[PDB]
mmCIF file of C-alpha atoms in Angstrom:
data_model
loop_
_atom_site.group_PDB
_atom_site.id
_atom_site.type_symbol
_atom_site.label_atom_id
_atom_site.label_comp_id
_atom_site.label_asym_id
_atom_site.label_seq_id
_atom_site.Cartn_x
_atom_site.Cartn_y
_atom_site.Cartn_z
ATOM 1 C CA UNK A 1 -7.506 -18.466 -39.904
ATOM 2 C CA UNK A 2 -4.122 -18.401 -40.328
ATOM 3 C CA UNK A 3 -0.484 -17.133 -41.038
ATOM 4 C CA UNK A 4 -3.091 -13.551 -41.786
ATOM 5 C CA UNK A 5 -1.130 -10.912 -39.842
ATOM 6 C CA UNK A 6 1.757 -10.476 -42.678
ATOM 7 C CA UNK A 7 0.385 -10.365 -45.903
ATOM 8 C CA UNK A 8 -2.009 -7.110 -44.155
ATOM 9 C CA UNK A 9 1.036 -6.190 -43.166
ATOM 10 C CA UNK A 10 2.933 -6.575 -46.835
ATOM 11 C CA UNK A 11 -0.008 -5.584 -49.082
ATOM 12 C CA UNK A 12 0.043 -1.616 -46.710
ATOM 13 C CA UNK A 13 3.627 -2.071 -47.736
ATOM 14 C CA UNK A 14 3.383 -3.389 -50.975
ATOM 15 C CA UNK A 15 0.851 -1.053 -52.707
ATOM 16 C CA UNK A 16 2.207 1.839 -50.450
ATOM 17 C CA UNK A 17 -1.576 2.408 -48.506
ATOM 18 C CA UNK A 18 -1.516 5.131 -46.263
ATOM 19 C CA UNK A 19 -2.149 3.596 -42.635
ATOM 20 C CA UNK A 20 -3.108 5.298 -39.239
ATOM 21 C CA UNK A 21 -1.003 3.578 -36.370
ATOM 22 C CA UNK A 22 -3.020 3.775 -32.784
ATOM 23 C CA UNK A 23 -1.387 2.627 -29.826
ATOM 24 C CA UNK A 24 -1.263 1.251 -26.581
ATOM 25 C CA UNK A 25 -0.887 5.350 -24.585
ATOM 26 C CA UNK A 26 -3.164 7.008 -27.107
ATOM 27 C CA UNK A 27 -1.237 8.105 -30.072
ATOM 28 C CA UNK A 28 -1.550 8.015 -33.215
ATOM 29 C CA UNK A 29 0.550 7.310 -36.510
ATOM 30 C CA UNK A 30 0.622 8.429 -39.355
ATOM 31 C CA UNK A 31 3.100 7.379 -42.591
ATOM 32 C CA UNK A 32 4.030 4.131 -45.200
ATOM 33 C CA UNK A 33 4.452 0.823 -43.453
ATOM 34 C CA UNK A 34 8.436 0.748 -44.761
ATOM 35 C CA UNK A 35 8.959 -3.155 -43.354
ATOM 36 C CA UNK A 36 8.847 -4.895 -40.027
ATOM 37 C CA UNK A 37 10.121 -7.899 -38.758
ATOM 38 C CA UNK A 38 8.496 -9.756 -35.724
ATOM 39 C CA UNK A 39 8.767 -7.893 -33.145
ATOM 40 C CA UNK A 40 8.821 -4.065 -34.999
ATOM 41 C CA UNK A 41 6.932 -2.422 -37.855
ATOM 42 C CA UNK A 42 8.507 0.464 -39.649
ATOM 43 C CA UNK A 43 6.865 3.506 -40.163
ATOM 44 C CA UNK A 44 8.179 5.847 -42.193
ATOM 45 C CA UNK A 45 6.000 9.441 -42.806
ATOM 46 C CA UNK A 46 7.646 12.706 -44.416
ATOM 47 C CA UNK A 47 10.160 13.839 -41.739
ATOM 48 C CA UNK A 48 11.637 9.814 -40.483
ATOM 49 C CA UNK A 49 11.236 6.837 -40.504
ATOM 50 C CA UNK A 50 9.634 5.096 -36.937
ATOM 51 C CA UNK A 51 9.942 2.041 -35.260
ATOM 52 C CA UNK A 52 6.808 0.512 -34.715
ATOM 53 C CA UNK A 53 6.972 -1.966 -30.925
ATOM 54 C CA UNK A 54 4.355 -4.411 -32.093
ATOM 55 C CA UNK A 55 3.076 -5.154 -28.895
ATOM 56 C CA UNK A 56 2.309 -1.058 -28.746
ATOM 57 C CA UNK A 57 -0.325 -1.884 -31.061
ATOM 58 C CA UNK A 58 -3.696 -1.514 -30.819
ATOM 59 C CA UNK A 59 -4.474 -0.901 -34.322
ATOM 60 C CA UNK A 60 -3.852 -0.259 -38.033
ATOM 61 C CA UNK A 61 -6.048 1.487 -40.046
ATOM 62 C CA UNK A 62 -5.595 1.137 -43.566
ATOM 63 C CA UNK A 63 -6.340 4.593 -46.117
ATOM 64 C CA UNK A 64 -8.785 1.839 -47.643
ATOM 65 C CA UNK A 65 -8.480 -1.866 -47.613
ATOM 66 C CA UNK A 66 -6.069 -4.388 -48.628
ATOM 67 C CA UNK A 67 -7.462 -7.482 -50.561
ATOM 68 C CA UNK A 68 -5.191 -10.923 -48.814
ATOM 69 C CA UNK B 1 -11.923 -25.418 -20.954
ATOM 70 C CA UNK B 2 -9.904 -26.001 -23.317
ATOM 71 C CA UNK B 3 -9.041 -24.451 -27.406
ATOM 72 C CA UNK B 4 -12.981 -21.727 -26.501
ATOM 73 C CA UNK B 5 -11.329 -18.572 -28.109
ATOM 74 C CA UNK B 6 -10.855 -20.393 -32.211
ATOM 75 C CA UNK B 7 -14.556 -21.334 -31.935
ATOM 76 C CA UNK B 8 -16.109 -18.397 -30.430
ATOM 77 C CA UNK B 9 -14.033 -15.699 -33.250
ATOM 78 C CA UNK B 10 -15.166 -18.259 -35.952
ATOM 79 C CA UNK B 11 -19.823 -18.375 -35.164
ATOM 80 C CA UNK B 12 -18.537 -14.372 -34.526
ATOM 81 C CA UNK B 13 -17.663 -15.002 -38.048
ATOM 82 C CA UNK B 14 -19.651 -17.434 -40.190
ATOM 83 C CA UNK B 15 -22.682 -16.009 -38.496
ATOM 84 C CA UNK B 16 -21.758 -12.519 -39.006
ATOM 85 C CA UNK B 17 -22.492 -11.055 -35.598
ATOM 86 C CA UNK B 18 -21.806 -8.104 -35.288
ATOM 87 C CA UNK B 19 -19.603 -7.253 -32.702
ATOM 88 C CA UNK B 20 -17.854 -4.789 -30.035
ATOM 89 C CA UNK B 21 -14.119 -5.145 -29.667
ATOM 90 C CA UNK B 22 -13.055 -2.920 -26.074
ATOM 91 C CA UNK B 23 -9.250 -2.248 -26.637
ATOM 92 C CA UNK B 24 -6.771 -1.474 -23.673
ATOM 93 C CA UNK B 25 -6.847 2.321 -24.528
ATOM 94 C CA UNK B 26 -11.021 3.358 -23.941
ATOM 95 C CA UNK B 27 -11.679 2.615 -27.774
ATOM 96 C CA UNK B 28 -14.058 0.752 -28.797
ATOM 97 C CA UNK B 29 -14.173 -1.134 -32.267
ATOM 98 C CA UNK B 30 -18.213 -1.932 -33.805
ATOM 99 C CA UNK B 31 -18.329 -4.407 -37.214
ATOM 100 C CA UNK B 32 -17.866 -8.073 -38.044
ATOM 101 C CA UNK B 33 -15.392 -9.745 -37.734
ATOM 102 C CA UNK B 34 -13.764 -10.865 -41.105
ATOM 103 C CA UNK B 35 -10.478 -13.529 -40.579
ATOM 104 C CA UNK B 36 -8.833 -13.247 -38.043
ATOM 105 C CA UNK B 37 -5.072 -15.607 -36.700
ATOM 106 C CA UNK B 38 -2.467 -16.476 -34.206
ATOM 107 C CA UNK B 39 -2.257 -12.885 -33.030
ATOM 108 C CA UNK B 40 -4.758 -10.419 -34.935
ATOM 109 C CA UNK B 41 -8.252 -9.972 -35.659
ATOM 110 C CA UNK B 42 -9.354 -8.380 -38.841
ATOM 111 C CA UNK B 43 -12.998 -6.068 -38.438
ATOM 112 C CA UNK B 44 -14.634 -4.709 -40.941
ATOM 113 C CA UNK B 45 -16.644 -1.925 -40.430
ATOM 114 C CA UNK B 46 -18.903 0.206 -43.547
ATOM 115 C CA UNK B 47 -15.891 2.153 -44.071
ATOM 116 C CA UNK B 48 -12.388 -0.789 -44.358
ATOM 117 C CA UNK B 49 -11.412 -3.872 -42.522
ATOM 118 C CA UNK B 50 -7.915 -2.850 -40.468
ATOM 119 C CA UNK B 51 -5.959 -5.181 -37.893
ATOM 120 C CA UNK B 52 -6.446 -5.830 -34.199
ATOM 121 C CA UNK B 53 -3.841 -6.511 -32.415
ATOM 122 C CA UNK B 54 -5.571 -9.535 -29.193
ATOM 123 C CA UNK B 55 -3.029 -8.498 -27.109
ATOM 124 C CA UNK B 56 -4.407 -5.396 -27.668
ATOM 125 C CA UNK B 57 -8.601 -6.595 -26.852
ATOM 126 C CA UNK B 58 -9.532 -6.539 -23.703
ATOM 127 C CA UNK B 59 -12.731 -8.214 -23.951
ATOM 128 C CA UNK B 60 -15.420 -9.231 -27.588
ATOM 129 C CA UNK B 61 -19.289 -8.192 -26.678
ATOM 130 C CA UNK B 62 -21.328 -9.785 -29.587
ATOM 131 C CA UNK B 63 -24.273 -7.960 -30.707
ATOM 132 C CA UNK B 64 -26.129 -11.685 -29.573
ATOM 133 C CA UNK B 65 -25.164 -14.496 -28.295
ATOM 134 C CA UNK B 66 -23.173 -17.081 -30.341
ATOM 135 C CA UNK B 67 -23.774 -21.117 -29.232
ATOM 136 C CA UNK B 68 -20.952 -22.705 -29.914
ATOM 137 C CA UNK C 1 10.413 -9.250 -42.769
ATOM 138 C CA UNK C 2 12.995 -10.504 -40.882
ATOM 139 C CA UNK C 3 15.158 -9.215 -38.726
ATOM 140 C CA UNK C 4 15.181 -5.653 -38.998
ATOM 141 C CA UNK C 5 15.008 -4.552 -35.149
ATOM 142 C CA UNK C 6 18.669 -4.723 -34.270
ATOM 143 C CA UNK C 7 19.915 -3.432 -36.946
ATOM 144 C CA UNK C 8 17.815 -0.259 -36.707
ATOM 145 C CA UNK C 9 19.436 0.202 -32.480
ATOM 146 C CA UNK C 10 22.799 -1.103 -34.664
ATOM 147 C CA UNK C 11 22.302 2.084 -36.772
ATOM 148 C CA UNK C 12 21.259 4.425 -34.877
ATOM 149 C CA UNK C 13 24.039 3.586 -31.782
ATOM 150 C CA UNK C 14 26.786 3.634 -34.037
ATOM 151 C CA UNK C 15 25.896 6.478 -35.720
ATOM 152 C CA UNK C 16 25.583 8.418 -32.798
ATOM 153 C CA UNK C 17 21.507 9.534 -33.453
ATOM 154 C CA UNK C 18 19.567 11.299 -30.811
ATOM 155 C CA UNK C 19 16.425 9.458 -30.596
ATOM 156 C CA UNK C 20 13.146 10.149 -29.410
ATOM 157 C CA UNK C 21 11.603 7.085 -27.527
ATOM 158 C CA UNK C 22 8.337 7.117 -25.894
ATOM 159 C CA UNK C 23 6.615 5.394 -23.378
ATOM 160 C CA UNK C 24 3.910 3.120 -23.096
ATOM 161 C CA UNK C 25 2.748 5.243 -19.902
ATOM 162 C CA UNK C 26 3.361 8.735 -22.056
ATOM 163 C CA UNK C 27 7.150 9.645 -20.686
ATOM 164 C CA UNK C 28 9.386 10.520 -22.747
ATOM 165 C CA UNK C 29 12.447 9.969 -23.621
ATOM 166 C CA UNK C 30 15.381 11.222 -25.586
ATOM 167 C CA UNK C 31 18.654 10.216 -26.025
ATOM 168 C CA UNK C 32 22.033 8.722 -27.392
ATOM 169 C CA UNK C 33 21.860 4.599 -28.165
ATOM 170 C CA UNK C 34 24.325 3.800 -26.135
ATOM 171 C CA UNK C 35 23.314 -0.272 -26.261
ATOM 172 C CA UNK C 36 20.719 -2.846 -26.135
ATOM 173 C CA UNK C 37 19.883 -6.917 -25.422
ATOM 174 C CA UNK C 38 16.957 -9.007 -25.717
ATOM 175 C CA UNK C 39 14.761 -7.299 -22.722
ATOM 176 C CA UNK C 40 15.633 -3.407 -22.580
ATOM 177 C CA UNK C 41 17.791 -0.261 -23.995
ATOM 178 C CA UNK C 42 19.883 1.283 -22.977
ATOM 179 C CA UNK C 43 19.325 5.822 -23.075
ATOM 180 C CA UNK C 44 22.353 8.254 -22.651
ATOM 181 C CA UNK C 45 21.383 12.155 -22.094
ATOM 182 C CA UNK C 46 23.134 14.041 -20.750
ATOM 183 C CA UNK C 47 22.968 12.904 -17.120
ATOM 184 C CA UNK C 48 22.481 9.246 -17.157
ATOM 185 C CA UNK C 49 22.116 6.111 -18.706
ATOM 186 C CA UNK C 50 19.023 3.883 -17.592
ATOM 187 C CA UNK C 51 17.871 1.608 -19.404
ATOM 188 C CA UNK C 52 14.083 1.649 -20.463
ATOM 189 C CA UNK C 53 12.810 -2.009 -21.055
ATOM 190 C CA UNK C 54 11.435 -2.898 -24.721
ATOM 191 C CA UNK C 55 8.212 -3.745 -23.067
ATOM 192 C CA UNK C 56 7.714 -0.485 -22.557
ATOM 193 C CA UNK C 57 8.713 1.657 -25.283
ATOM 194 C CA UNK C 58 5.985 2.192 -28.195
ATOM 195 C CA UNK C 59 7.467 4.182 -30.785
ATOM 196 C CA UNK C 60 11.756 4.837 -31.521
ATOM 197 C CA UNK C 61 11.899 8.571 -33.777
ATOM 198 C CA UNK C 62 14.951 9.247 -34.802
ATOM 199 C CA UNK C 63 16.553 12.694 -35.019
ATOM 200 C CA UNK C 64 16.323 11.647 -39.541
ATOM 201 C CA UNK C 65 16.466 8.314 -40.455
ATOM 202 C CA UNK C 66 18.751 5.248 -40.418
ATOM 203 C CA UNK C 67 19.621 3.649 -43.800
ATOM 204 C CA UNK C 68 20.353 -0.140 -43.505
ATOM 205 C CA UNK D 1 2.154 -22.718 -5.778
ATOM 206 C CA UNK D 2 1.192 -25.359 -8.599
ATOM 207 C CA UNK D 3 -1.928 -25.009 -10.712
ATOM 208 C CA UNK D 4 -4.318 -23.267 -8.376
ATOM 209 C CA UNK D 5 -5.447 -20.287 -11.299
ATOM 210 C CA UNK D 6 -8.231 -23.281 -12.879
ATOM 211 C CA UNK D 7 -9.424 -24.836 -10.217
ATOM 212 C CA UNK D 8 -10.174 -20.916 -8.680
ATOM 213 C CA UNK D 9 -11.916 -19.925 -12.726
ATOM 214 C CA UNK D 10 -14.554 -24.004 -12.108
ATOM 215 C CA UNK D 11 -14.520 -23.916 -9.240
ATOM 216 C CA UNK D 12 -17.170 -20.646 -9.607
ATOM 217 C CA UNK D 13 -17.950 -22.004 -12.957
ATOM 218 C CA UNK D 14 -19.085 -25.125 -11.767
ATOM 219 C CA UNK D 15 -21.383 -23.355 -8.188
ATOM 220 C CA UNK D 16 -22.663 -20.691 -10.499
ATOM 221 C CA UNK D 17 -21.230 -18.283 -7.838
ATOM 222 C CA UNK D 18 -21.535 -14.247 -9.033
ATOM 223 C CA UNK D 19 -18.269 -12.243 -10.333
ATOM 224 C CA UNK D 20 -16.253 -9.047 -11.231
ATOM 225 C CA UNK D 21 -13.815 -9.280 -13.278
ATOM 226 C CA UNK D 22 -11.770 -5.968 -13.411
ATOM 227 C CA UNK D 23 -10.349 -5.171 -16.359
ATOM 228 C CA UNK D 24 -6.851 -3.772 -17.194
ATOM 229 C CA UNK D 25 -8.293 -0.337 -18.724
ATOM 230 C CA UNK D 26 -10.442 0.336 -15.724
ATOM 231 C CA UNK D 27 -13.381 -1.260 -16.836
ATOM 232 C CA UNK D 28 -15.895 -3.547 -14.181
ATOM 233 C CA UNK D 29 -17.585 -7.206 -16.138
ATOM 234 C CA UNK D 30 -20.634 -8.216 -14.353
ATOM 235 C CA UNK D 31 -21.687 -12.125 -14.991
ATOM 236 C CA UNK D 32 -21.085 -15.780 -14.932
ATOM 237 C CA UNK D 33 -18.136 -17.999 -15.139
ATOM 238 C CA UNK D 34 -19.403 -19.738 -18.947
ATOM 239 C CA UNK D 35 -15.446 -21.518 -19.871
ATOM 240 C CA UNK D 36 -12.131 -20.699 -19.930
ATOM 241 C CA UNK D 37 -9.107 -22.052 -21.885
ATOM 242 C CA UNK D 38 -5.264 -21.214 -22.207
ATOM 243 C CA UNK D 39 -6.725 -17.282 -23.550
ATOM 244 C CA UNK D 40 -9.868 -15.612 -22.414
ATOM 245 C CA UNK D 41 -12.653 -16.188 -20.342
ATOM 246 C CA UNK D 42 -16.255 -16.375 -21.429
ATOM 247 C CA UNK D 43 -18.112 -14.262 -19.536
ATOM 248 C CA UNK D 44 -22.541 -14.147 -19.319
ATOM 249 C CA UNK D 45 -24.882 -11.923 -17.802
ATOM 250 C CA UNK D 46 -28.501 -11.453 -18.275
ATOM 251 C CA UNK D 47 -27.753 -10.145 -22.605
ATOM 252 C CA UNK D 48 -25.471 -12.032 -24.391
ATOM 253 C CA UNK D 49 -21.993 -14.770 -23.538
ATOM 254 C CA UNK D 50 -18.626 -12.187 -23.887
ATOM 255 C CA UNK D 51 -15.086 -13.358 -24.597
ATOM 256 C CA UNK D 52 -12.353 -11.126 -22.169
ATOM 257 C CA UNK D 53 -9.084 -11.959 -22.461
ATOM 258 C CA UNK D 54 -7.379 -13.204 -19.132
ATOM 259 C CA UNK D 55 -4.415 -10.968 -20.247
ATOM 260 C CA UNK D 56 -6.655 -7.245 -19.781
ATOM 261 C CA UNK D 57 -8.008 -8.777 -16.458
ATOM 262 C CA UNK D 58 -6.024 -7.246 -13.279
ATOM 263 C CA UNK D 59 -8.152 -9.550 -10.938
ATOM 264 C CA UNK D 60 -11.849 -12.030 -10.700
ATOM 265 C CA UNK D 61 -13.070 -11.381 -7.364
ATOM 266 C CA UNK D 62 -16.192 -13.402 -6.472
ATOM 267 C CA UNK D 63 -19.350 -12.309 -4.634
ATOM 268 C CA UNK D 64 -18.280 -15.326 -1.589
ATOM 269 C CA UNK D 65 -15.110 -17.074 -1.382
ATOM 270 C CA UNK D 66 -15.382 -20.917 -3.682
ATOM 271 C CA UNK D 67 -13.178 -23.976 -1.134
ATOM 272 C CA UNK D 68 -10.843 -25.477 -3.391
ATOM 273 C CA UNK E 1 24.002 -6.506 -28.171
ATOM 274 C CA UNK E 2 23.972 -9.561 -25.488
ATOM 275 C CA UNK E 3 23.812 -10.235 -21.813
ATOM 276 C CA UNK E 4 22.794 -6.484 -20.604
ATOM 277 C CA UNK E 5 20.321 -6.288 -18.676
ATOM 278 C CA UNK E 6 21.605 -8.479 -15.469
ATOM 279 C CA UNK E 7 24.839 -6.598 -15.599
ATOM 280 C CA UNK E 8 23.228 -2.883 -15.240
ATOM 281 C CA UNK E 9 21.334 -4.336 -11.500
ATOM 282 C CA UNK E 10 24.544 -6.397 -10.993
ATOM 283 C CA UNK E 11 26.217 -3.346 -10.398
ATOM 284 C CA UNK E 12 23.951 -1.007 -8.803
ATOM 285 C CA UNK E 13 23.070 -3.367 -6.341
ATOM 286 C CA UNK E 14 26.480 -4.398 -5.854
ATOM 287 C CA UNK E 15 27.656 -0.520 -5.276
ATOM 288 C CA UNK E 16 24.764 0.388 -3.740
ATOM 289 C CA UNK E 17 23.531 2.891 -6.244
ATOM 290 C CA UNK E 18 20.133 4.539 -5.875
ATOM 291 C CA UNK E 19 17.370 4.503 -8.808
ATOM 292 C CA UNK E 20 14.196 5.330 -10.088
ATOM 293 C CA UNK E 21 12.047 3.070 -11.339
ATOM 294 C CA UNK E 22 9.400 4.541 -13.336
ATOM 295 C CA UNK E 23 5.888 2.834 -14.030
ATOM 296 C CA UNK E 24 3.524 1.500 -16.351
ATOM 297 C CA UNK E 25 1.499 3.021 -14.447
ATOM 298 C CA UNK E 26 2.552 6.234 -13.479
ATOM 299 C CA UNK E 27 3.970 5.633 -9.707
ATOM 300 C CA UNK E 28 7.838 6.537 -9.131
ATOM 301 C CA UNK E 29 9.899 4.226 -7.394
ATOM 302 C CA UNK E 30 13.484 5.099 -5.096
ATOM 303 C CA UNK E 31 15.505 2.816 -3.199
ATOM 304 C CA UNK E 32 18.798 0.267 -4.074
ATOM 305 C CA UNK E 33 18.466 -2.791 -5.966
ATOM 306 C CA UNK E 34 18.415 -5.227 -3.390
ATOM 307 C CA UNK E 35 18.314 -8.137 -5.844
ATOM 308 C CA UNK E 36 17.089 -9.767 -8.636
ATOM 309 C CA UNK E 37 15.664 -12.989 -11.229
ATOM 310 C CA UNK E 38 13.581 -12.981 -14.166
ATOM 311 C CA UNK E 39 10.263 -11.554 -12.859
ATOM 312 C CA UNK E 40 10.858 -9.434 -10.678
ATOM 313 C CA UNK E 41 13.431 -6.794 -8.981
ATOM 314 C CA UNK E 42 13.964 -6.496 -5.263
ATOM 315 C CA UNK E 43 13.464 -2.813 -3.711
ATOM 316 C CA UNK E 44 14.357 -1.666 -0.989
ATOM 317 C CA UNK E 45 14.068 1.600 0.086
ATOM 318 C CA UNK E 46 14.006 2.752 3.949
ATOM 319 C CA UNK E 47 10.755 0.884 4.991
ATOM 320 C CA UNK E 48 10.896 -2.358 3.185
ATOM 321 C CA UNK E 49 11.920 -4.616 1.172
ATOM 322 C CA UNK E 50 9.398 -4.233 -2.252
ATOM 323 C CA UNK E 51 8.922 -6.682 -4.716
ATOM 324 C CA UNK E 52 8.348 -5.607 -8.537
ATOM 325 C CA UNK E 53 7.385 -7.637 -11.570
ATOM 326 C CA UNK E 54 9.711 -6.139 -14.582
ATOM 327 C CA UNK E 55 7.171 -6.305 -16.157
ATOM 328 C CA UNK E 56 5.706 -2.962 -15.071
ATOM 329 C CA UNK E 57 9.304 -1.456 -15.330
ATOM 330 C CA UNK E 58 9.145 1.066 -18.605
ATOM 331 C CA UNK E 59 12.778 2.760 -16.853
ATOM 332 C CA UNK E 60 15.701 2.809 -13.899
ATOM 333 C CA UNK E 61 16.672 5.472 -13.569
ATOM 334 C CA UNK E 62 19.795 5.217 -11.641
ATOM 335 C CA UNK E 63 20.853 8.559 -9.672
ATOM 336 C CA UNK E 64 24.753 7.995 -11.014
ATOM 337 C CA UNK E 65 25.339 6.260 -14.356
ATOM 338 C CA UNK E 66 26.968 2.487 -13.640
ATOM 339 C CA UNK E 67 29.533 1.527 -15.753
ATOM 340 C CA UNK E 68 29.505 -2.149 -17.063
ATOM 341 C CA UNK F 1 20.423 -13.753 -9.298
ATOM 342 C CA UNK F 2 17.534 -17.064 -9.828
ATOM 343 C CA UNK F 3 13.944 -17.600 -8.428
ATOM 344 C CA UNK F 4 13.557 -14.748 -5.317
ATOM 345 C CA UNK F 5 9.690 -14.714 -6.539
ATOM 346 C CA UNK F 6 8.461 -17.482 -5.244
ATOM 347 C CA UNK F 7 10.742 -17.244 -1.882
ATOM 348 C CA UNK F 8 9.363 -13.632 -1.235
ATOM 349 C CA UNK F 9 5.352 -14.819 -1.979
ATOM 350 C CA UNK F 10 6.120 -18.295 0.553
ATOM 351 C CA UNK F 11 7.607 -16.011 3.384
ATOM 352 C CA UNK F 12 4.813 -13.482 2.524
ATOM 353 C CA UNK F 13 2.024 -16.155 2.315
ATOM 354 C CA UNK F 14 3.517 -18.511 6.155
ATOM 355 C CA UNK F 15 3.770 -15.444 7.312
ATOM 356 C CA UNK F 16 0.622 -13.857 8.034
ATOM 357 C CA UNK F 17 1.630 -10.670 6.943
ATOM 358 C CA UNK F 18 -0.019 -7.900 5.030
ATOM 359 C CA UNK F 19 0.242 -6.387 1.511
ATOM 360 C CA UNK F 20 -0.778 -4.011 -0.164
ATOM 361 C CA UNK F 21 -0.501 -4.736 -4.260
ATOM 362 C CA UNK F 22 -0.582 -1.930 -6.688
ATOM 363 C CA UNK F 23 -2.041 -2.919 -9.976
ATOM 364 C CA UNK F 24 -1.058 -1.858 -13.405
ATOM 365 C CA UNK F 25 -4.433 0.128 -13.681
ATOM 366 C CA UNK F 26 -4.184 2.096 -10.208
ATOM 367 C CA UNK F 27 -5.734 -0.021 -8.084
ATOM 368 C CA UNK F 28 -4.787 -0.925 -4.620
ATOM 369 C CA UNK F 29 -5.657 -4.092 -2.828
ATOM 370 C CA UNK F 30 -4.852 -5.063 0.471
ATOM 371 C CA UNK F 31 -4.942 -8.473 2.413
ATOM 372 C CA UNK F 32 -2.927 -11.573 3.130
ATOM 373 C CA UNK F 33 -1.069 -13.419 0.500
ATOM 374 C CA UNK F 34 -3.340 -17.107 0.200
ATOM 375 C CA UNK F 35 -1.909 -18.480 -2.493
ATOM 376 C CA UNK F 36 0.029 -18.230 -6.194
ATOM 377 C CA UNK F 37 0.546 -20.098 -9.540
ATOM 378 C CA UNK F 38 2.916 -19.587 -12.158
ATOM 379 C CA UNK F 39 -0.331 -16.860 -13.042
ATOM 380 C CA UNK F 40 -1.881 -15.305 -10.338
ATOM 381 C CA UNK F 41 -1.922 -14.944 -6.945
ATOM 382 C CA UNK F 42 -5.065 -15.271 -4.778
ATOM 383 C CA UNK F 43 -5.426 -12.830 -2.189
ATOM 384 C CA UNK F 44 -8.013 -13.151 0.913
ATOM 385 C CA UNK F 45 -9.085 -10.379 3.009
ATOM 386 C CA UNK F 46 -12.061 -10.008 5.422
ATOM 387 C CA UNK F 47 -15.157 -10.071 2.729
ATOM 388 C CA UNK F 48 -13.866 -12.761 0.015
ATOM 389 C CA UNK F 49 -10.362 -13.773 -1.313
ATOM 390 C CA UNK F 50 -10.198 -12.520 -4.890
ATOM 391 C CA UNK F 51 -8.012 -13.610 -7.823
ATOM 392 C CA UNK F 52 -5.021 -10.828 -8.790
ATOM 393 C CA UNK F 53 -3.016 -12.000 -12.590
ATOM 394 C CA UNK F 54 0.708 -11.541 -11.950
ATOM 395 C CA UNK F 55 0.703 -9.692 -15.479
ATOM 396 C CA UNK F 56 -1.659 -7.302 -13.880
ATOM 397 C CA UNK F 57 1.037 -6.440 -10.471
ATOM 398 C CA UNK F 58 2.977 -3.469 -10.928
ATOM 399 C CA UNK F 59 4.687 -4.475 -7.556
ATOM 400 C CA UNK F 60 3.414 -6.188 -3.781
ATOM 401 C CA UNK F 61 4.748 -3.833 -0.827
ATOM 402 C CA UNK F 62 4.413 -6.229 2.660
ATOM 403 C CA UNK F 63 3.346 -4.045 5.693
ATOM 404 C CA UNK F 64 7.310 -5.228 7.234
ATOM 405 C CA UNK F 65 9.952 -6.399 4.844
ATOM 406 C CA UNK F 66 10.147 -11.008 5.404
ATOM 407 C CA UNK F 67 13.620 -11.413 4.725
ATOM 408 C CA UNK F 68 14.121 -14.923 2.322
#
């Protein structure tokens, strides 16, 4: 397929679906997808919005499926 | 050879073959290949469809060979 | 979205917000974002300014959110 | 040198030389090189043909040298 | 910012400042920056000059800050 | 600097200098640099010539410095 990663993150962002982001070092982050660009995902939890590099993400697991 | 990765994922997707996706952090994911694009594989199990970055995949092991 | 990583690092740099930079090897660095370019972030603490490769950064966690 | 990786994998493929493929997570795969493209190696053992991403391969060790 | 990584390594090289280079596998190298190019840093210690791939470097920590 | 990685590997290859190649998974390989291309280094020891992906190499340590 073509051009699927952005619709997936946009659906999560617009529907406010909580996610778990598993990083290549074994860190698991949880929060809301606030925004993203070519390189990063901005992930907000109750404390702060942090900047996650896509190159370090292995998988993004939503709390429920988003229908693209 | 040339242009083999997409036929392999497409065969898995169309034939509904279960896979194991081994990630660079040692996580093993199991499910169905729902879709893919240049950067990601959408992997569905009984809970959710998650977005897996190809850069984090080491190997994809089908439950049976697909014949391309 | 588009062109978000540079506004985020610039806000941190200009507002002097302390950060934690988590690296893919499990090192956590703390300090101030002094500068950055296409490839690196220069991170200053009380000892020195060190050069961090973006490819090795998983997430940058500010002490407080920056509003872009 | 120039253009050596494809002759090496092609020699292994055509001569049916068993290989060990060491991945960046510490997995060692064994089998035959069935095919490859810009991004992947298809590796067959007695069970299945699996798709290995080149980005995850550290070294490919043949059972004997191939003479290119 | 723009074009900062080369001035940083050049300052270290010209001023003979000792560095610690932390690699993604957890190796820490120490020595002098002898030279660098698009892909590598040549790092000299009392034994030898070794070739370090930038893709494997997480952070370069000078013994003192260099002023660019 | 510019265009240093190839002169370094070529000097090792032509002078038959033994090397240690440290990989991102912690494997250390030893042998002779037989050849290289844009993506790989062919490393020969007494058993076989193996194909090492540059993306997986952290540092190459010669038994003695090569003078470029």
